[PDB]
Structures are given as C-alpha cells and as structure tokens.
Amino acid sequence: YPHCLQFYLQPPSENISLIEFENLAIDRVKLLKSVENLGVSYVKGTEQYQSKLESELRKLKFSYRENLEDEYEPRRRDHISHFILRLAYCQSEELRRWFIQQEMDLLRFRFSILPKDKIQDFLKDSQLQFEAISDEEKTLREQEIVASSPSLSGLKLGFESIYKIPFADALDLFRGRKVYLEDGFAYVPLKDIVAIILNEFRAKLSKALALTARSLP
Amino acid sequence: EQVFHFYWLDAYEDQYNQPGVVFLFGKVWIESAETHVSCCVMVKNIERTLYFLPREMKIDLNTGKETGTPISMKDVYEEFDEKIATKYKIMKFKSKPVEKNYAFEIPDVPEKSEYLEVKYSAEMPQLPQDLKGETFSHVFGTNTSSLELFLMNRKIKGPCWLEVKSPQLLNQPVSWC
Amino acid sequence: METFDPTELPELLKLYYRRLFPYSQYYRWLNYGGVIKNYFQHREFSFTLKDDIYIRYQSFNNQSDLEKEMQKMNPYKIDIGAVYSHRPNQHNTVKLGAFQAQEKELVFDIDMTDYDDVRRCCSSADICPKCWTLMTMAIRIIDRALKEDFGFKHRLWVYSGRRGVHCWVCDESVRKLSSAVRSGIVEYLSLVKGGQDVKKKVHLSEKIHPFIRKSINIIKKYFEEYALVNQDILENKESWDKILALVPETIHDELQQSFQKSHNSLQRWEHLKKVASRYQNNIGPWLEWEIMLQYCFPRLDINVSKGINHLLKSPFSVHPKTGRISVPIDLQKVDQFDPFTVPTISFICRELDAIRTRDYKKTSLAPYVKVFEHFLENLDKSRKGELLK
Amino acid sequence: GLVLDPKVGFYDKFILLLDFNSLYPSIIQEFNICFTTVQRVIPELPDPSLEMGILPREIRKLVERRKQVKQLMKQQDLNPDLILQYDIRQKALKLTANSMYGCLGFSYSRFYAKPLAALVTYKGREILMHTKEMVQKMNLEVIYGDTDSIMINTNSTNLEEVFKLGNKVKSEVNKLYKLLEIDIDGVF
Ligand SMILES: [Zn+2]
C-alpha cells in the first residue's frame, strides 16, 4: 500500500544517538541476511516467499503505521539504515557484490506490492520521465503492440497498463526488435519496465558504492 | 694530437665563489711508475640554460586582460633583448627556438610546446624564479646547478673512464693531487 | 566527343574551389546557428592530397580560414569527422587521454558492393539504370523508419558518386548519442544476417514485426518491375538452382515439374506462389517473403555507424575517378533519380569560358544546390520554434 | 597503507611467511601509472589501450635485467669470481627497483606528485584484501600481513606439503595479475 520504495539518494543530514546508530545497522543486517535465505529456500513468486518477507518487514519495523509525513518512523529507519550500511559493505568487492545483489531483491519485492495506480506517481517522482497511456490509445495501437510483442503464445492482452518511454532508455529492448516503436517512443508492459528500473537502480548503487570506498579513511 | 684518460670517482662545485667551474677527482694510469695515481681535472665555462614559455595572447600586466595581438617567437626574442637582458645586466647570450615536452605539477603548461632556449655565462646574475613578462608566461631552468648540467648534458652514468682532449696545464696547483 | 581526361583534374579543380564550392552553406551547416561556443572550431576535417597524402587532424577558426586553406591546398578528397574537446590541430598540446570525440552526426551508407549475389545485369565495376532501383528502394525503406520509428526529422541524403548513397542525420538530440545506442539502431534496421557465405540469411517467425510488414509493403510496389522482368531470376537451370538452394528439400521435385510446364517468368513466379501456399496450408516460415526480402532488402555495415570518430566522404566533393560530384538527393523525387545526368565539373566549365561571390547562380550545379539550403532552412525553424519558446 | 591486525596466539604447526617482491613497483607496471598518462588535478586509472609511459618503461628494464642475471647464474663449472659478480649485480638491481615508489610519496622529493601517490597506495590495499580472500577460501589462515609480507598458517606438519601448499598460493595470486610475484621467505 504505502510509498516505502525509494531510490536511495541524498544522504541523511540528521544526527542520532549511538544506541539508535547501532540498532539500525543491526536490524538492517538481519533483514538483508534473511532476504538471501528466503531467496535460497524458495522462489520469488510464491505465497510463502511474499508472506514471510512481509511478516519479517513488519517485525523489524521497516514499514508500519503512519506519522506526520517527514518523521514517518519506518521510512526514516529505512533511509538511515541503508546509508549506514553502505559504509560497512563499501570495503571489499565480494561484500560490494553481495550488498548490491541483496538490495535489489528487496526493491523487487516492494515494487511487487504497489497498487496499480501508485506506480505512475512513483515513476514521475523517480529519475525524470515515465508516462502511461489511456485505454483509447492503447486500443488504437493494440494490434501493433501485440504483433511487436515477443514470441509469447496467443493474443492474451489483459488489463495490464502499458508505458511509453524514450527509445534510448529502452535500448536493451529495441535493438532486438522486441518492442513497438513510434516517433522516438517505445510501448512497454510492466515486466520489462521493472527490469529497466532494476537495471538503473543497480547502476546508480554500484556507482555510489564505488565512490564511497574512496573517502573511507 | 694529445688525449688523456682518467677514471673519475667524485666531483665538486663551488657555485658561490667559483661559478661555472667543476672539479673531477679520479685515478690516472702511469706507464713509468707502473701504477695509478690521483688526478684532478678542472672543467670550466658551463652555461646557464633557461626556457621561456610564450603566451597564446599578449596580456597587459597593468590590468590583466588580453590585447588581441598574436604572440610569436620573435616577440619574445625582442622583449628579452630589450627589456630583461638590459635590466639584469646580461651582455652576451645565445637564443634558439626549441620544441619540448612537459608533464609535471605546474598548472597551465602544454605537454608539447615551443620554448625560447637562452644560454649565457654563469658569472652573470641569476634571474628570479617567478619572473614574468608581457610576452612569456613562465621560465624554467633558473636555479639549475652546474654539476647536474654537466652530468646530464654529457651522459655520465656513475664512475667511468673519461677522455679529455686538448689537455691544459694549470699555472699554480689547486689540489693536493 | 573526346575521352574524359582524369589528368586535367588539377586544372578544373582550381576554378571549382575558387568560384563554385558553396563555402557559405558549408559554414552554416557545420556551425549550426552558432548556438554553442566552439562547435565549428573543434570540428575535424581530413584532406586527401596529391600522391595519396593523408593528413587527418585539421581544424579551422571561421569561414575565411576555411576558404583560404582549401584554396591554397586544393585537396583531392575531403572527409568530415566528429567534434572534439580540443582543437584537432592542437591535440599534442594536451595530455594523452584527454583528447576524445564528443559529438557527430548519425551516418548511414548503402553501396552496390553488398549486392554481389543479387545483380545479374552488370559486373562489380558497372552500374546501369535497371539495377539502380536497388538504391532507390533502399532510400524509401530506411528514410521511413528514421522518420516514423525513431522520429528523426532532419535527414540529408547525398550521392556517394558512383555506387551508393549516404544519409546524414543531423538532429540536435541525435548528435550526442552514445556508441551503444548507434549500434542498437543499426541492429534494429539490419535484416540480412550475411556472414561468410551462409546458405540462408533471412529467417522469419509466425509473427512479423510492423517494421518487417512495412518493409515488405514498400518492396511490393517494385518487385515485379525489377526482379521478374528485368533480372529474370528464373531463366536458366543454374539461375533457379540458387533459389531452390533455399527451399526445403521436399519441395524441389514438385517445383521442377511445375516449372518445366511453364512458359514465362511471371507464370513461374505464380506457380511458386501457389506451391508455397499449398505447402504452407499443410504445415509457417512464410516462404513467399524470405526470397523476396533476401533479394531486395538493403544491407548496412555496423562499423560505419558504430564509430563516433569515423571519417566519411563530405558532401559537394569530387570523385577523382569518375568526376561525378557528391550531390544531395531531393527527397521529393527519389524514384526518378538518374545517376548519369549529374553534371560534372567538366560539363559546365567549357561553355562558360566562351561567353560575397555568387557566380554559381548561372551554373548547372545550381538546381541541385537549392536542395541544400532547403535542408539548411529547416534547421533554423527547429531552433527558432522549440528553443525560443 | 593497509595493515592487517596480527592474530595473537601460539601456533603449533608450520607457518609459511611470504614477501611481496616490489608490490608498489608492480602496480606502476600493471596499471600503467606515470606522469605523462594519469589525468590529475583520487584520480582515475588510465584506459588499457594506451601505450606505456616513461616511468613504467624504466621499471621494465630493471626487472628484465634481473632475469638474465638469474638464469646466467644457473650454469655450472664456472669461474669463482663471476659467481660473486653476478650475485652482487642481482642484488643491486633488486634494491634499485624496490625503492622506486619513494620518489612519488616522499614530500621532500624533486618528483613529488600527491595524486599519483594516492592512486598507487589505493590499488595496493585492494591487492592486499584480495589476496587475503583467496587464502582463506582454500582453508588457510592469514595471521598477519603488512604491505610487503604475509604470514600464513597452514595447519600442516609435513614440510614437503608446506612448500607444495606455498607454491599453490603463488599461482593463485599470479593468475589474476601478471607482473607482481610472491616469493617464499622462510618457514617457522
Ligand atoms: Zn545493373
């Protein structure tokens, strides 16, 4: 339900006590360690995976009841914990790979929870540009979008929304002739969209982690 | 008609009192005595060498703005000849345009450029390190010692046998050698 | 009357470069309205001079130096490169690693040498009007995509001089694409996977992309006029053996027995269509379209467009072998282009001598030149409209 | 300069201590770090497509001179005076090469370059942490390491196996890099 997703940017400028500093780091390590175990013992799209991950997120207090916008306790905890835990894992390359890998599974899970209407607002609040299309235009180009779609069998074009993005941002999709192109824009379904979002988040996070280790002394 | 060899071990220079002269101490073989003896060789007239870096445009030092007049080697030549040499009491010198590289920690220097190479006697006064002018931005080689110049120019790699051509005889002894 | 003399080239080249070359339009195009600081002073030109002399990193300050240094040198060939962070003639000044290309137009080339298995009318060194359709069909195949699929507005089409065409995409957002994006764009438009003599080069699925559909639709209007009546791909046993080499093995016997009863190429093509449809109905790779696409779809080279620092032939140049001027092509009349009516430097000069500088208005080069400022004019409209408001 | 805290304690089994023979000179040669190559005002490493610089090319000649001296000493039935001359020559080239980084990090040096020194040092601590990861993966314990030495606990009692185990670490590190080479120092 809530807007707990964030591209982790703009480090916190607050100040905290030592007890909170230690507790946030320990809790974040626990969460990320259990995400890997859930991924190993199950698959990413089962009821058990979702249920256990959500229960654990409830237990560690990383998404819960509301507060006045800014000092939303779970959002604040999540932000400060992530930026604290960057310092611990910036040192080694094996640690960097682990941190990058585990921090994307949580983003995938959280994006899987969003209602079908808040995704547009999240995307617009995100980097610069993602836009959706109405049912009129979607039906206008329905046949061309279906033909341009990959070898997936049948004409099952459900109610899932379709997003228009600049062609360059969809590079990995258009060089293989796997999306419909019209005047510098590509019409993409949800799955490829979340793939693009994950790839961009991975690139930004890798850049930030590489930069952090420089200023560690 | 006469040439003599010697094996140098140590070198000495007195910039303050005897500028532009170096002393080489070593060993010289003697046929009559069937043994080597100590030897001292005086090397004189080592010239100061400096490199002037021209600007891409003439800068008015009074304000700090360009005047739009292009800069060439000849402009630097005349500015040195009529402004710097007379000011710092320099009688005779030699000037030449050279092409040189530079890859070190002084800002705003090209990695390949044309410099004005000026050579003059070491007896004449020493220019300041930070000397600047209208036509040249920087100067290199101001405080280079004579021994390093002699070593680098002649490519002496440690102790070795050196040939001296046209040897001369000192009027009065200058060493216990 | 007299044979064309290539040794006279130094004589005519002088007055061409003095009185005919459009220096003003050249400067306007390569300056792009003077929007950015040194978009022209950082441009690299390559001059191929006498004795195959190859000088690469050139640069100029403004128009006057440009005219002066082409009039004092008179190069045999002129190539345009990318814009760099430092002046190309001043690259040894900077440290090794700080000199790199930044922006360049998007260049496509199409050449006759890529159709060695398609032409049965002239040899490798010859062109003729009845195969030049392979060049015009390409022009409307690609120009559509860049206008529709990718939304590129300002495109310039130039004659290579003897056996091909060049496309310069000069849109503002196209000049700053990364090399990976250009490679992806070339991948999108590439259909024939021509390797080192592979038997089959075109593969299709049950579902065809709209790009493929429109490409087939465009080719259909010229297929029978060129392939079936002008090339006669079905007139000798060795001739149709090439096509049978691509058909599935079970069909050749029936095709041979149906073809032996035929009497004209059109009837053979119709019989092939019927046989293909009949085989389709029982068992669909679309047999009717692979041989049609393989024989007519243009083939591009990735290396030309992938490189951001590539050097390509400049417009309004002179071919030193044939003499033909690398002239812009008018997009309004593409199907009626004739390579053999392009005026040479020799053609206009001889009549003229028997009679700020604007002497080109009375020349035969002028009607083709009016195409160029039309391309130039459209660029200021984009600048004036979108930027100022 | 990275330093790994020693694992204080008493050890019963054989301990293999290794040396990084010119760790810093090897980094200058590995990543092409020079005055005429590194773009500076921590700077970024140069592209691998560039040619060798002035400084890396002078370290090549120093270690290409050692191998010929090393192999020339392998001959038998040789004059007793040449044995010392080649051994002295080998040590002279060994000493000169190792102290090359000093002209970059010495504040009172004529060729001082702060950005250049920082880049070499930063890569140095990466190679150190990388080596530590490899050793612990093959069920071996690192009990100390400081920038020119590594002490490894082997849990072995057979001396023949210790050298065999030691040469395996040699190949493991030398697989990823090319010029830096570890060397056996002694056994406790
Ligand atoms: Zn032909």
What is the DSSP code string of A17-66? -HHHHHHHHHHHHHHHHHHHHHHHHS-TTSHHHHHHHHHHHHHTTSS-S-
DSSP β-bridge partners for residue B60: B65
The C-alpha of A212 sits at a distance from chain D's nearest C-alpha, in angstroms, of 12
Q: Does C98 contact chain D (CB < 8 Å)?
A: yes
Q: Which tokens go with D158?
A: 């057979």
Nearest CA in chain C to D45: C97
Q: What is the dihedral of CA C180, C182, C183, C187, to 10 degrees?
A: 130
What residues contact D131, with CB distance under 8 A and at least 6 apart?
Answer: D145, D150, D173
Using the structure block, give the residue that is written with the tokens 């190859």.
C54
CA–CA gap between residue A87 and residue A209 (Å, rounded): 9
CA–CA gap between residue D172 and residue A145 (Å, rounded): 52
Which H helix or E strand runs over C110? strand C106-111
Neighbours of A211 (CB within 10 A): 11
Angle between the A47-59 and A18-41 helix axes, to the nearest 10 degrees? 170
Pairs across A and C, CB distance < 8 A: 42
Q: Which tokens go with C146?
A: 């860049």
Is the distance from CB of C142 to CB of C298 less than 8 angstroms? yes
Q: How far is the CA of C241 from the centre of ligand 1 (A)?
A: 21
Task: Tell me if residue B126 falls in helix, strand or coil.
Answer: coil
Angle between the C23-31 and C63-71 helix axes, to the nearest 10 degrees? 130
Q: Which amino acid belongs to residue C324?
A: R
What residues contact A33, with CB distance under 8 A and at least 6 apart?
Answer: none
How do A163-166 and A131-132 pair as beta strands?
antiparallel
Is the distance from CB of B66 to CB of B77 less than 8 angstroms? no
Q: Chains that contact B by 3+ CB pairs under 8 Å?
A: C, D
Is the distance from CB of C320 to CB of C6 less than 8 angstroms? yes
Q: Find out whether C111 is annotated in a ligand binding site.
A: yes
Residues of chain D with Cβ-Cβ distance to C96 below 8 Å are 36-37, 50-51
Q: Which tokens go with D185?
A: 């120092």
Q: Which tokens go with C16?
A: 């061409």
What residues contact C373, with CB distance under 8 A and at least 6 apart?
Answer: C25
Q: Chains that contact D by 3+ CB pairs under 8 Å?
A: A, B, C
Is the distance from CB of C17 to CB of C349 less than 8 angstroms? no
Using the structure block, give the residue that is written with the tokens 């465009």.
C218
> Any alpha helices (H) in D106-158, and if so which ranges?
114-137
CA–CA gap between residue B108 and residue A11 (Å, rounded): 36
Q: Does A182 contact chain C (CB < 8 Å)?
A: yes
Q: Count helices and strands (H / E) in chain D.
A: 6, 4
Q: Does A174 contact chain C (CB < 8 Å)?
A: yes
Is the distance from CB of B23 to CB of B170 less than 8 angstroms? no
What residues contact C387, with CB distance under 8 A and at least 6 apart?
Answer: C35
Tell me how far CA of residue B106 lies from CA of B57, B143, C248, D65, D110, in angstroms: 20, 16, 73, 34, 13
**What does the DSSP assignment read for D58-85?**
HHHHHHHHHHHHHHHTT-SS--HHHHHH
CA–CA gap between residue D135 and residue D154 (Å, rounded): 10
Task: Tell me if residue B75 falls in helix, strand or coil.
Answer: helix
Q: Which tokens go with C217?
A: 């639709």
**Counting every residue, how long is chain B?**
177
A112: alpha, beta or left, given left = phi > 0 and alpha = psi -120 to 50?
alpha
Q: Which amino acid belongs to residue A159?
A: F
Nearest to C158 by CA among C45, C22, C16, C326: C326
Which H helix or E strand runs over C165? strand C164-169
Q: Find out whether C153 is annotated in a ligand binding site.
A: no
Provide the sign of the torsion angle of the four alpha carbons D56, D60, D66, D70, taken in this order: positive
CA–CA gap between residue A160 and residue C179 (Å, rounded): 34
Q: How far is the CA of C230 from the centre of ligand 1 (A)?
A: 10
Nearest to C289 by CA among C381, C213, C194: C213
Q: Which amino acid belongs to residue C77?
A: K
- Catalogue the active-site residues of C: 44, 109, 111
Q: Find out whether C358 is annotated in a ligand binding site.
A: no
Tell me how far CA of residue D73 lies from CA of A10, C120, C140, D90, in angstroms: 62, 72, 75, 10
Tell me how far CA of residue B31 lies from CA of B35, B173, B176, in angstroms: 7, 23, 21
Is the distance from CB of C250 to CB of C287 less than 8 angstroms? no
CA–CA gap between residue B105 and residue D116 (Å, rounded): 11
Q: How far is the CA of C217 from the centre of ligand 1 (A)?
A: 24
Q: Which tokens go with B10?
A: 């140590």
Is the distance from CB of C108 to CB of C142 less than 8 angstroms? yes
* Chain B residues 84-113 with CB within 8 Å of chain D: 101, 103-105, 111
The C-alpha of C219 sits at a distance from chain A's nearest C-alpha, in angstroms, of 20
Is the distance from CB of C107 to CB of C166 less than 8 angstroms? yes
Q: Does A46 contact chain D (CB < 8 Å)?
A: no
Q: Which amino acid belongs to residue C27?
A: Y
